[PDB]
Amino acid sequence: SMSVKKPKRDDSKDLALCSMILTEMETHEDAWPFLLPVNLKLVPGYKKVIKKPMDFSTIREKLSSGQYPNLETFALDVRLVFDNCETFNEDDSDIGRAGHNMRKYFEKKWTDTFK
């Protein structure tokens, strides 16, 4: 509360470390469904159904331009990429499997880097 603070966690490396995680996600072989925004002119249903589209290139631009106020808002956009994927794609599809694999990969890197 006022004049009552928990000990200050060192957050000075968060930017760099979120960048590294995102590089590793970008270079995974199963990243291909997630590298670029879904083309809303060419994919029927996407625009209406997915209220908040997100992809790796859009996270990379937000990160590089100081649009993430803290590491939680960064994790929320990465998870949004996978939650979108699950909303639109069957589990038993190449893209559906890609999303589950990438989510697992992300979550482990997140815990190992920060928890």
mmCIF file of N, CA and C in Angstrom:
data_model
loop_
_atom_site.group_PDB
_atom_site.id
_atom_site.type_symbol
_atom_site.label_atom_id
_atom_site.label_comp_id
_atom_site.label_asym_id
_atom_site.label_seq_id
_atom_site.Cartn_x
_atom_site.Cartn_y
_atom_site.Cartn_z
ATOM 1 N N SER A 1 0.917 -1.169 0.000
ATOM 2 C CA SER A 1 0.000 0.000 0.000
ATOM 3 C C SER A 1 0.940 1.198 0.000
ATOM 4 N N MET A 2 0.431 2.416 0.322
ATOM 5 C CA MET A 2 1.285 3.631 0.393
ATOM 6 C C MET A 2 2.463 3.506 1.326
ATOM 7 N N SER A 3 3.691 3.717 0.784
ATOM 8 C CA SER A 3 4.965 3.640 1.566
ATOM 9 C C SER A 3 5.250 2.190 2.122
ATOM 10 N N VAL A 4 4.606 1.218 1.527
ATOM 11 C CA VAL A 4 4.740 -0.236 1.935
ATOM 12 C C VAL A 4 4.898 -1.099 0.725
ATOM 13 N N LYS A 5 6.153 -1.457 0.446
ATOM 14 C CA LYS A 5 6.486 -2.222 -0.782
ATOM 15 C C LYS A 5 7.218 -3.501 -0.544
ATOM 16 N N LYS A 6 6.820 -4.555 -1.249
ATOM 17 C CA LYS A 6 7.671 -5.757 -1.397
ATOM 18 C C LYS A 6 9.044 -5.392 -1.921
ATOM 19 N N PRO A 7 10.065 -6.185 -1.566
ATOM 20 C CA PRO A 7 11.416 -6.008 -2.127
ATOM 21 C C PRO A 7 11.426 -5.953 -3.705
ATOM 22 N N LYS A 8 12.198 -4.992 -4.271
ATOM 23 C CA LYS A 8 12.168 -4.687 -5.733
ATOM 24 C C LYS A 8 12.866 -5.825 -6.541
ATOM 25 N N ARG A 9 12.083 -6.715 -7.168
ATOM 26 C CA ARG A 9 12.549 -7.629 -8.257
ATOM 27 C C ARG A 9 13.258 -6.884 -9.421
ATOM 28 N N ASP A 10 14.414 -7.411 -9.828
ATOM 29 C CA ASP A 10 15.235 -6.752 -10.851
ATOM 30 C C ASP A 10 14.619 -7.094 -12.231
ATOM 31 N N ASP A 11 14.089 -6.080 -12.892
ATOM 32 C CA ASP A 11 13.299 -6.272 -14.121
ATOM 33 C C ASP A 11 14.050 -5.738 -15.333
ATOM 34 N N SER A 12 15.302 -5.333 -15.127
ATOM 35 C CA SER A 12 16.111 -4.630 -16.131
ATOM 36 C C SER A 12 16.507 -5.478 -17.354
ATOM 37 N N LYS A 13 16.516 -6.789 -17.197
ATOM 38 C CA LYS A 13 16.796 -7.761 -18.259
ATOM 39 C C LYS A 13 15.530 -8.375 -18.937
ATOM 40 N N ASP A 14 14.361 -8.007 -18.474
ATOM 41 C CA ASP A 14 13.134 -8.671 -18.972
ATOM 42 C C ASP A 14 13.004 -8.512 -20.527
ATOM 43 N N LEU A 15 13.180 -7.278 -20.999
ATOM 44 C CA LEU A 15 13.106 -6.947 -22.426
ATOM 45 C C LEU A 15 13.955 -7.832 -23.300
ATOM 46 N N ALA A 16 15.221 -7.962 -22.944
ATOM 47 C CA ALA A 16 16.136 -8.779 -23.636
ATOM 48 C C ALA A 16 15.778 -10.230 -23.567
ATOM 49 N N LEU A 17 15.381 -10.698 -22.389
ATOM 50 C CA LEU A 17 15.024 -12.111 -22.234
ATOM 51 C C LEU A 17 13.669 -12.534 -22.995
ATOM 52 N N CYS A 18 12.696 -11.627 -22.998
ATOM 53 C CA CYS A 18 11.460 -11.859 -23.801
ATOM 54 C C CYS A 18 11.806 -11.914 -25.328
ATOM 55 N N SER A 19 12.733 -11.051 -25.742
ATOM 56 C CA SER A 19 13.266 -11.078 -27.130
ATOM 57 C C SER A 19 13.902 -12.416 -27.497
ATOM 58 N N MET A 20 14.719 -12.959 -26.617
ATOM 59 C CA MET A 20 15.304 -14.268 -26.814
ATOM 60 C C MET A 20 14.301 -15.395 -26.885
ATOM 61 N N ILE A 21 13.362 -15.439 -25.961
ATOM 62 C CA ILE A 21 12.285 -16.413 -26.050
ATOM 63 C C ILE A 21 11.547 -16.323 -27.405
ATOM 64 N N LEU A 22 11.212 -15.101 -27.817
ATOM 65 C CA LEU A 22 10.460 -14.887 -29.045
ATOM 66 C C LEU A 22 11.288 -15.357 -30.245
ATOM 67 N N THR A 23 12.636 -15.097 -30.225
ATOM 68 C CA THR A 23 13.528 -15.663 -31.278
ATOM 69 C C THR A 23 13.459 -17.182 -31.384
ATOM 70 N N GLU A 24 13.416 -17.854 -30.253
ATOM 71 C CA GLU A 24 13.387 -19.272 -30.204
ATOM 72 C C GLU A 24 12.034 -19.796 -30.718
ATOM 73 N N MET A 25 10.959 -19.065 -30.424
ATOM 74 C CA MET A 25 9.627 -19.405 -30.972
ATOM 75 C C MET A 25 9.588 -19.221 -32.503
ATOM 76 N N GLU A 26 10.121 -18.105 -32.983
ATOM 77 C CA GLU A 26 10.251 -17.794 -34.411
ATOM 78 C C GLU A 26 11.000 -18.849 -35.227
ATOM 79 N N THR A 27 11.982 -19.501 -34.638
ATOM 80 C CA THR A 27 12.840 -20.428 -35.334
ATOM 81 C C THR A 27 12.441 -21.872 -35.136
ATOM 82 N N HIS A 28 11.429 -22.168 -34.333
ATOM 83 C CA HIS A 28 10.911 -23.513 -34.186
ATOM 84 C C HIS A 28 10.296 -23.959 -35.569
ATOM 85 N N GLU A 29 10.467 -25.228 -35.895
ATOM 86 C CA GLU A 29 9.969 -25.723 -37.157
ATOM 87 C C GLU A 29 8.433 -25.699 -37.245
ATOM 88 N N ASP A 30 7.712 -25.673 -36.131
ATOM 89 C CA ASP A 30 6.274 -25.662 -36.114
ATOM 90 C C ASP A 30 5.697 -24.198 -35.974
ATOM 91 N N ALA A 31 6.531 -23.201 -36.158
ATOM 92 C CA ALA A 31 6.118 -21.813 -36.040
ATOM 93 C C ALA A 31 5.303 -21.284 -37.259
ATOM 94 N N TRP A 32 5.449 -21.963 -38.411
ATOM 95 C CA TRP A 32 4.910 -21.471 -39.710
ATOM 96 C C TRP A 32 3.442 -21.001 -39.707
ATOM 97 N N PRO A 33 2.508 -21.616 -38.915
ATOM 98 C CA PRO A 33 1.170 -21.027 -38.920
ATOM 99 C C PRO A 33 1.021 -19.641 -38.231
ATOM 100 N N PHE A 34 2.059 -19.247 -37.454
ATOM 101 C CA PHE A 34 2.040 -18.153 -36.492
ATOM 102 C C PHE A 34 2.981 -16.996 -36.864
ATOM 103 N N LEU A 35 3.775 -17.105 -37.918
ATOM 104 C CA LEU A 35 4.828 -16.113 -38.214
ATOM 105 C C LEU A 35 4.270 -14.751 -38.658
ATOM 106 N N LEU A 36 3.141 -14.778 -39.356
ATOM 107 C CA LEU A 36 2.524 -13.603 -39.991
ATOM 108 C C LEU A 36 1.064 -13.530 -39.663
ATOM 109 N N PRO A 37 0.466 -12.314 -39.707
ATOM 110 C CA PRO A 37 -0.980 -12.203 -39.496
ATOM 111 C C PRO A 37 -1.782 -13.079 -40.494
ATOM 112 N N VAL A 38 -2.829 -13.710 -39.999
ATOM 113 C CA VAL A 38 -3.804 -14.445 -40.855
ATOM 114 C C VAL A 38 -4.373 -13.437 -41.856
ATOM 115 N N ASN A 39 -4.466 -13.850 -43.126
ATOM 116 C CA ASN A 39 -4.898 -12.919 -44.183
ATOM 117 C C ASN A 39 -6.461 -12.887 -44.137
ATOM 118 N N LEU A 40 -6.967 -11.794 -43.631
ATOM 119 C CA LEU A 40 -8.398 -11.635 -43.389
ATOM 120 C C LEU A 40 -9.237 -11.497 -44.631
ATOM 121 N N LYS A 41 -8.617 -11.158 -45.762
ATOM 122 C CA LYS A 41 -9.303 -11.211 -47.070
ATOM 123 C C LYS A 41 -9.400 -12.639 -47.594
ATOM 124 N N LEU A 42 -8.457 -13.521 -47.249
ATOM 125 C CA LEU A 42 -8.397 -14.834 -47.868
ATOM 126 C C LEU A 42 -8.839 -15.968 -47.015
ATOM 127 N N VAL A 43 -9.160 -15.743 -45.733
ATOM 128 C CA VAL A 43 -9.574 -16.833 -44.849
ATOM 129 C C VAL A 43 -10.962 -16.544 -44.321
ATOM 130 N N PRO A 44 -11.970 -17.190 -44.971
ATOM 131 C CA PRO A 44 -13.369 -17.029 -44.544
ATOM 132 C C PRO A 44 -13.605 -17.338 -43.066
ATOM 133 N N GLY A 45 -14.347 -16.476 -42.423
ATOM 134 C CA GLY A 45 -14.773 -16.661 -41.016
ATOM 135 C C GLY A 45 -13.831 -16.023 -40.007
ATOM 136 N N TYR A 46 -12.563 -15.842 -40.405
ATOM 137 C CA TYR A 46 -11.522 -15.385 -39.392
ATOM 138 C C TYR A 46 -11.773 -14.039 -38.803
ATOM 139 N N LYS A 47 -12.084 -13.097 -39.707
ATOM 140 C CA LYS A 47 -12.336 -11.721 -39.257
ATOM 141 C C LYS A 47 -13.469 -11.608 -38.207
ATOM 142 N N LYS A 48 -14.600 -12.238 -38.510
ATOM 143 C CA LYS A 48 -15.774 -12.224 -37.593
ATOM 144 C C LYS A 48 -15.589 -13.049 -36.322
ATOM 145 N N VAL A 49 -14.925 -14.188 -36.461
ATOM 146 C CA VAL A 49 -14.865 -15.092 -35.306
ATOM 147 C C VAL A 49 -13.768 -14.688 -34.310
ATOM 148 N N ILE A 50 -12.615 -14.269 -34.812
ATOM 149 C CA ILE A 50 -11.412 -14.062 -33.898
ATOM 150 C C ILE A 50 -11.324 -12.586 -33.615
ATOM 151 N N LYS A 51 -11.715 -12.204 -32.427
ATOM 152 C CA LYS A 51 -11.945 -10.798 -32.139
ATOM 153 C C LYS A 51 -10.597 -10.039 -32.012
ATOM 154 N N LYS A 52 -9.555 -10.757 -31.578
ATOM 155 C CA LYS A 52 -8.252 -10.149 -31.409
ATOM 156 C C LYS A 52 -7.130 -10.996 -32.040
ATOM 157 N N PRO A 53 -6.901 -10.817 -33.316
ATOM 158 C CA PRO A 53 -5.850 -11.563 -34.024
ATOM 159 C C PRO A 53 -4.498 -11.210 -33.449
ATOM 160 N N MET A 54 -3.648 -12.226 -33.350
ATOM 161 C CA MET A 54 -2.227 -11.975 -32.918
ATOM 162 C C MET A 54 -1.322 -12.979 -33.607
ATOM 163 N N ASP A 55 -0.062 -12.595 -33.864
ATOM 164 C CA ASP A 55 0.915 -13.433 -34.527
ATOM 165 C C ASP A 55 2.318 -13.024 -34.040
ATOM 166 N N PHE A 56 3.355 -13.833 -34.358
ATOM 167 C CA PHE A 56 4.713 -13.558 -33.862
ATOM 168 C C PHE A 56 5.265 -12.248 -34.383
ATOM 169 N N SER A 57 5.046 -11.932 -35.691
ATOM 170 C CA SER A 57 5.589 -10.684 -36.253
ATOM 171 C C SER A 57 5.011 -9.416 -35.579
ATOM 172 N N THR A 58 3.730 -9.427 -35.215
ATOM 173 C CA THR A 58 3.050 -8.381 -34.551
ATOM 174 C C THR A 58 3.552 -8.256 -33.072
ATOM 175 N N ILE A 59 3.849 -9.382 -32.421
ATOM 176 C CA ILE A 59 4.440 -9.334 -31.057
ATOM 177 C C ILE A 59 5.842 -8.732 -31.168
ATOM 178 N N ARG A 60 6.613 -9.159 -32.190
ATOM 179 C CA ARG A 60 7.976 -8.643 -32.393
ATOM 180 C C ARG A 60 8.007 -7.115 -32.584
ATOM 181 N N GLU A 61 7.086 -6.587 -33.356
ATOM 182 C CA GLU A 61 6.976 -5.133 -33.562
ATOM 183 C C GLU A 61 6.549 -4.381 -32.249
ATOM 184 N N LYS A 62 5.586 -4.943 -31.539
ATOM 185 C CA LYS A 62 5.159 -4.375 -30.260
ATOM 186 C C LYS A 62 6.334 -4.351 -29.244
ATOM 187 N N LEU A 63 7.054 -5.453 -29.165
ATOM 188 C CA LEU A 63 8.204 -5.572 -28.268
ATOM 189 C C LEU A 63 9.311 -4.539 -28.568
ATOM 190 N N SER A 64 9.709 -4.474 -29.837
ATOM 191 C CA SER A 64 10.696 -3.582 -30.322
ATOM 192 C C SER A 64 10.369 -2.093 -30.219
ATOM 193 N N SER A 65 9.125 -1.733 -29.954
ATOM 194 C CA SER A 65 8.662 -0.358 -29.968
ATOM 195 C C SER A 65 8.058 0.081 -28.641
ATOM 196 N N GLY A 66 8.360 -0.684 -27.580
ATOM 197 C CA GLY A 66 7.974 -0.350 -26.198
ATOM 198 C C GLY A 66 6.535 -0.336 -25.971
ATOM 199 N N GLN A 67 5.786 -1.254 -26.642
ATOM 200 C CA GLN A 67 4.341 -1.309 -26.415
ATOM 201 C C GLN A 67 3.911 -2.388 -25.357
ATOM 202 N N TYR A 68 4.873 -3.135 -24.804
ATOM 203 C CA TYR A 68 4.611 -4.010 -23.659
ATOM 204 C C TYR A 68 5.065 -3.298 -22.342
ATOM 205 N N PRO A 69 4.092 -2.970 -21.501
ATOM 206 C CA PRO A 69 4.494 -2.350 -20.238
ATOM 207 C C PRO A 69 5.188 -3.279 -19.277
ATOM 208 N N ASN A 70 5.001 -4.611 -19.356
ATOM 209 C CA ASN A 70 5.670 -5.490 -18.434
ATOM 210 C C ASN A 70 5.652 -6.922 -19.021
ATOM 211 N N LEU A 71 6.394 -7.852 -18.413
ATOM 212 C CA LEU A 71 6.518 -9.216 -19.014
ATOM 213 C C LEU A 71 5.144 -9.973 -19.027
ATOM 214 N N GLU A 72 4.204 -9.639 -18.147
ATOM 215 C CA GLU A 72 2.898 -10.282 -18.206
ATOM 216 C C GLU A 72 2.066 -9.944 -19.455
ATOM 217 N N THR A 73 2.182 -8.714 -19.936
ATOM 218 C CA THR A 73 1.382 -8.296 -21.054
ATOM 219 C C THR A 73 2.002 -8.997 -22.272
ATOM 220 N N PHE A 74 3.317 -9.275 -22.258
ATOM 221 C CA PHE A 74 3.979 -10.022 -23.358
ATOM 222 C C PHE A 74 3.449 -11.470 -23.417
ATOM 223 N N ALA A 75 3.408 -12.132 -22.271
ATOM 224 C CA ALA A 75 2.898 -13.554 -22.167
ATOM 225 C C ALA A 75 1.421 -13.629 -22.575
ATOM 226 N N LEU A 76 0.622 -12.615 -22.225
ATOM 227 C CA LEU A 76 -0.779 -12.596 -22.633
ATOM 228 C C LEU A 76 -0.944 -12.634 -24.216
ATOM 229 N N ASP A 77 -0.169 -11.835 -24.949
ATOM 230 C CA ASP A 77 -0.180 -11.873 -26.435
ATOM 231 C C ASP A 77 0.323 -13.194 -26.983
ATOM 232 N N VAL A 78 1.402 -13.771 -26.417
ATOM 233 C CA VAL A 78 1.853 -15.080 -26.919
ATOM 234 C C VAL A 78 0.703 -16.098 -26.723
ATOM 235 N N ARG A 79 0.099 -16.127 -25.522
ATOM 236 C CA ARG A 79 -0.983 -17.114 -25.228
ATOM 237 C C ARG A 79 -2.181 -16.871 -26.159
ATOM 238 N N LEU A 80 -2.466 -15.613 -26.490
ATOM 239 C CA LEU A 80 -3.540 -15.229 -27.403
ATOM 240 C C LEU A 80 -3.358 -15.869 -28.776
ATOM 241 N N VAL A 81 -2.097 -15.971 -29.251
ATOM 242 C CA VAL A 81 -1.772 -16.599 -30.538
ATOM 243 C C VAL A 81 -2.296 -18.083 -30.445
ATOM 244 N N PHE A 82 -2.043 -18.734 -29.311
ATOM 245 C CA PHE A 82 -2.452 -20.173 -29.204
ATOM 246 C C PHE A 82 -3.899 -20.430 -28.929
ATOM 247 N N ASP A 83 -4.519 -19.544 -28.148
ATOM 248 C CA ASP A 83 -5.959 -19.527 -27.898
ATOM 249 C C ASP A 83 -6.744 -19.248 -29.123
ATOM 250 N N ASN A 84 -6.315 -18.258 -29.914
ATOM 251 C CA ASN A 84 -6.891 -18.110 -31.292
ATOM 252 C C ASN A 84 -6.821 -19.367 -32.144
ATOM 253 N N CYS A 85 -5.643 -19.977 -32.187
ATOM 254 C CA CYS A 85 -5.434 -21.182 -32.969
ATOM 255 C C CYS A 85 -6.404 -22.307 -32.571
ATOM 256 N N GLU A 86 -6.578 -22.493 -31.265
ATOM 257 C CA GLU A 86 -7.467 -23.517 -30.748
ATOM 258 C C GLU A 86 -8.936 -23.204 -31.068
ATOM 259 N N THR A 87 -9.301 -21.934 -31.057
ATOM 260 C CA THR A 87 -10.648 -21.525 -31.434
ATOM 261 C C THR A 87 -11.036 -21.881 -32.904
ATOM 262 N N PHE A 88 -10.102 -21.738 -33.804
ATOM 263 C CA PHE A 88 -10.337 -21.844 -35.242
ATOM 264 C C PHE A 88 -9.957 -23.172 -35.895
ATOM 265 N N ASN A 89 -9.142 -24.010 -35.228
ATOM 266 C CA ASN A 89 -8.580 -25.173 -35.914
ATOM 267 C C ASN A 89 -8.901 -26.429 -35.060
ATOM 268 N N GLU A 90 -9.264 -27.484 -35.758
ATOM 269 C CA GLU A 90 -9.454 -28.788 -35.095
ATOM 270 C C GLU A 90 -8.116 -29.227 -34.450
ATOM 271 N N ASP A 91 -8.212 -29.854 -33.281
ATOM 272 C CA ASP A 91 -7.028 -30.529 -32.651
ATOM 273 C C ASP A 91 -6.306 -31.526 -33.582
ATOM 274 N N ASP A 92 -7.089 -32.320 -34.316
ATOM 275 C CA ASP A 92 -6.571 -33.289 -35.263
ATOM 276 C C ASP A 92 -6.372 -32.668 -36.677
ATOM 277 N N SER A 93 -5.442 -31.724 -36.758
ATOM 278 C CA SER A 93 -5.012 -31.044 -37.974
ATOM 279 C C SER A 93 -3.563 -30.645 -37.783
ATOM 280 N N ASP A 94 -2.863 -30.369 -38.863
ATOM 281 C CA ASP A 94 -1.475 -29.989 -38.721
ATOM 282 C C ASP A 94 -1.329 -28.683 -37.922
ATOM 283 N N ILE A 95 -2.162 -27.704 -38.243
ATOM 284 C CA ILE A 95 -2.143 -26.401 -37.541
ATOM 285 C C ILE A 95 -2.571 -26.564 -36.083
ATOM 286 N N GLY A 96 -3.567 -27.404 -35.817
ATOM 287 C CA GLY A 96 -4.075 -27.631 -34.454
ATOM 288 C C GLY A 96 -2.928 -28.244 -33.584
ATOM 289 N N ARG A 97 -2.232 -29.242 -34.124
ATOM 290 C CA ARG A 97 -1.107 -29.860 -33.450
ATOM 291 C C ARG A 97 0.051 -28.863 -33.253
ATOM 292 N N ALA A 98 0.347 -28.081 -34.295
ATOM 293 C CA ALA A 98 1.361 -27.022 -34.193
ATOM 294 C C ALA A 98 1.115 -26.116 -33.004
ATOM 295 N N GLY A 99 -0.131 -25.691 -32.829
ATOM 296 C CA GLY A 99 -0.485 -24.781 -31.693
ATOM 297 C C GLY A 99 -0.269 -25.369 -30.342
ATOM 298 N N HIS A 100 -0.654 -26.638 -30.189
ATOM 299 C CA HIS A 100 -0.383 -27.310 -28.922
ATOM 300 C C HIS A 100 1.072 -27.460 -28.689
ATOM 301 N N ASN A 101 1.875 -27.834 -29.721
ATOM 302 C CA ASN A 101 3.309 -28.003 -29.524
ATOM 303 C C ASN A 101 3.988 -26.693 -29.122
ATOM 304 N N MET A 102 3.635 -25.616 -29.849
ATOM 305 C CA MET A 102 4.230 -24.296 -29.607
ATOM 306 C C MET A 102 3.881 -23.738 -28.223
ATOM 307 N N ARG A 103 2.667 -23.918 -27.783
ATOM 308 C CA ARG A 103 2.243 -23.520 -26.441
ATOM 309 C C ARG A 103 3.062 -24.209 -25.325
ATOM 310 N N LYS A 104 3.214 -25.526 -25.447
ATOM 311 C CA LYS A 104 4.099 -26.265 -24.529
ATOM 312 C C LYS A 104 5.521 -25.768 -24.521
ATOM 313 N N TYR A 105 6.104 -25.526 -25.712
ATOM 314 C CA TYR A 105 7.420 -25.037 -25.850
ATOM 315 C C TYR A 105 7.597 -23.678 -25.176
ATOM 316 N N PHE A 106 6.627 -22.788 -25.406
ATOM 317 C CA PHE A 106 6.630 -21.446 -24.796
ATOM 318 C C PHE A 106 6.577 -21.522 -23.234
ATOM 319 N N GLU A 107 5.656 -22.308 -22.718
ATOM 320 C CA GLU A 107 5.389 -22.364 -21.311
ATOM 321 C C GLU A 107 6.577 -22.880 -20.494
ATOM 322 N N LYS A 108 7.321 -23.823 -21.060
ATOM 323 C CA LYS A 108 8.518 -24.305 -20.434
ATOM 324 C C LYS A 108 9.599 -23.225 -20.433
ATOM 325 N N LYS A 109 9.858 -22.571 -21.574
ATOM 326 C CA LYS A 109 10.819 -21.494 -21.613
ATOM 327 C C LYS A 109 10.453 -20.390 -20.654
ATOM 328 N N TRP A 110 9.167 -20.105 -20.492
ATOM 329 C CA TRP A 110 8.699 -19.057 -19.612
ATOM 330 C C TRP A 110 9.030 -19.362 -18.097
ATOM 331 N N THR A 111 8.687 -20.561 -17.661
ATOM 332 C CA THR A 111 8.944 -21.057 -16.325
ATOM 333 C C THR A 111 10.440 -21.124 -16.087
ATOM 334 N N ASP A 112 11.226 -21.643 -17.048
ATOM 335 C CA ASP A 112 12.648 -21.768 -16.809
ATOM 336 C C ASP A 112 13.372 -20.435 -16.764
ATOM 337 N N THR A 113 12.891 -19.440 -17.515
ATOM 338 C CA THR A 113 13.557 -18.164 -17.579
ATOM 339 C C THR A 113 13.193 -17.275 -16.375
ATOM 340 N N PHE A 114 11.953 -17.335 -15.886
ATOM 341 C CA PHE A 114 11.395 -16.358 -14.955
ATOM 342 C C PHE A 114 10.820 -16.930 -13.600
ATOM 343 N N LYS A 115 10.465 -18.215 -13.489
ATOM 344 C CA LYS A 115 9.889 -18.786 -12.233
ATOM 345 C C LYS A 115 10.909 -19.609 -11.411
#
